[PDB]
Amino acid sequence: YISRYLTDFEPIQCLGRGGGVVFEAKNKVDDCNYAIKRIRLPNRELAREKVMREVKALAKLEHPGIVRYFNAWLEAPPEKWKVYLYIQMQLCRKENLKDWMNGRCTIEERERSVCLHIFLQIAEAVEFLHSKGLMHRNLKPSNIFFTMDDVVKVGDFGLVTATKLYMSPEQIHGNSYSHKVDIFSLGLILFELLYPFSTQMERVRTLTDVRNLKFPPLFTQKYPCEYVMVQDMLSPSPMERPEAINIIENAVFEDL
Ligand SMILES: Cc1nc(N)c2c(-c3ccc(NC(=O)[C@H](O)c4cccc(F)c4)cc3C)cn(C)c2n1
Numbered sequence: 001y002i003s004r005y006l007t008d009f010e011p012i013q014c015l016g017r018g019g020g021v022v023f024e025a026k027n028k029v030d031d032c033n034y035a036i037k038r039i040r041l042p043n044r045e046l047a048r049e050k051v052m053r054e055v056k057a058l059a060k061l062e063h064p065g066i067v068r069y070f071n072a073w074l075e076a077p078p079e080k081w082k083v084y085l086y087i088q089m090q091l092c093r094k095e096n097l098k099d100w101m102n103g104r105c106t107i108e109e110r111e112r113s114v115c116l117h118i119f120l121q122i123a124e125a126v127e128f129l130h131s132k133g134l135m136h137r138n139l140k141p142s143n144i145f146f147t148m149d150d151v152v153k154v155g156d157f158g159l160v161t162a163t164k165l166y167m168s169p170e171q172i173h174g175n176s177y178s179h180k181v182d183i184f185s186l187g188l189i190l191f192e193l194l195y196p197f198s199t200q201m202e203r204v205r206t207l208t209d210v211r212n213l214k215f216p217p218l219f220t221q222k223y224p225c226e227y228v229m230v231q232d233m234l235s236p237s238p239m240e241r242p243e244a245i246n247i248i249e250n251a252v253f254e255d256l
Helices: 004-008 045-059 099-101 110-130 180-194 200-209 215-224 223-233 244-247
Strands: 007-015 022-025 033-040 067-077 082-089 145-148 151-154
Touching: 004 067, 007 033, 022 180, 045 082, 067 200, 099 145, 099 180, 110 151, 110 180, 110 244, 180 200, 180 215, 180 223, 180 244, 200 223, 215 223
Parallel strands: none
Antiparallel strands: 007 022, 022 033, 033 082, 067 082, 145 151
8 A cells, every 4th residue: 555665765776586585775764775675474374473583583683794684574565466574784885795706816816815804704704693593504605795894794694484506415405404504605605715717617617526625736735724624614524514613713814
């Protein structure tokens, strides 16, 4: 009849394709642009109560590696011919980690100091979520962001409502059983951060190999201690993989 989203915000564009939709909308009152995730909630009533308990425990979250929350509200519009859950989140930089990485193809432009710094933020963000008994399960360059303050942000996660390149095996076939799946994703990210790429062909080919622990020799030589971690993080038996804390507490994560 009269939508909360339509009255309070004037849309700019769309950003994300749902697995729900994500718009860039200016709040008219405070005249700031935000990322607004629109979700179609489950018609099953008891599945809904679970989703709400999550937004309740999600709103609580506050961490520098986590995107800033603002407001969450519901809309039950008239069937044009269903209830939506809108979520207002801090709008991040148009250049995400994927965009950033595909702008820097030289092993120089991937300076060791900058890459370890970036990854640590991603690692710390997961430590936090893991400490709260939460798992991200959407870790990939396409869904890692920078603020207008150049601070790294682990992207959209949670509120599942029931590329697989960074997904762990058990995540691709199974129920994504353990939080370890995030550790695995971190592994491939750290690699791709350190090891540049020329083509999508190379990216896919090399990463598909690195998934099965086939590392370019140039890498293993140049970065030996990181290679130890990336192995540990990719360890094919999840239980073998380090906890988010163990990664942050490493010799490499110092001298900065
Ligand atoms: C430019 C930009 N900025 C963003 N913030 C985004 C996002 C985005 C990133 C993160 C989330 N949500 C979250 O991180 C969590 O779901 C969450 C929810 C409530 C409270 C929390 F503390 C955390 C939701 C979007 C749309 C997705 N896309 C494509 C974006 N694009």
